[PDB]
Write a protein that binds this ligand. Structure first.
Ligand SMILES: C[C@@H](Nc1ncnc2[nH]ccc12)[C@@H]1CCOC1
Length: 164
């Protein structure tokens, strides 16, 4: 049901799109959230996905943290996808603006290998402060399952494709 994606490799595809609008159209099995360790969905992809769930994602996430404590940087958890997907895979990439080790980006992408197909953003890019060209290269060299990347910024999408 994914449409309009450019094929980059055997298993990685990319499109200039808002991941929230893509999830509402496709209703995939798994949508990836660019989470932080506390699952506090304030801005970027996380704030946008949470708003589309009418804050149900944040209520579920607060119950998960009250029970389990915070995630690790590089880690993940599977929660409901609410009205957007069957499941949401909350993945924590390193936030370079907070001094987190960029080597953890490969560990973050390894979480995608537990799922046959995913709709996802570029981890650690945008407000997380890492170089998006590096994030796409780590994605391609780490993920083996089928990943559909939605990149919101038009200008960054064009740069990612033309430098691939
Ligand atoms: C990390 C990434 N943020 C998003 N990529 C996809 N869907 C999104 N929806 C809300 C944010 C968002 C970068 C910021 C703009 O494009 C690249």
């Amino acid at each position: 049901s994914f449409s309009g994606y450019l094929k980059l490799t055997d298993n990685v595809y990319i499109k200039n799109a808002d991941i929230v609008e893509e999830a509402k159209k496709v209703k995939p099995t798994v949508v990836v959230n660019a989470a932080n360790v506390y699952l506090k969905h304030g801005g970027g992809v996380a704030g946008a996905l949470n708003k589309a769930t009418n804050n149900a994602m944040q209520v579920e996430s607060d119950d998960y943290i009250a029970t389990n404590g915070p995630l690790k940087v590089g880690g993940s958890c599977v929660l409901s996808g609410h009205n957007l997907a069957k499941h949401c895979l909350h993945v924590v990439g390193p936030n370079v603006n907070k001094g987190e080790d960029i080597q953890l980006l490969k560990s973050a992408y390894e979480n995608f290998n537990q799922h046959e197909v995913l709709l996802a953003p570029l981890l650690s890019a945008g407000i997380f402060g890492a170089d998006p060209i590096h994030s796409l290269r780590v994605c391609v060299d780490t993920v083996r399952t089928n990943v559909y990347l939605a990149v919101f910024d038009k200008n960054l999408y064009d740069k990612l494709v033309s430098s691939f």
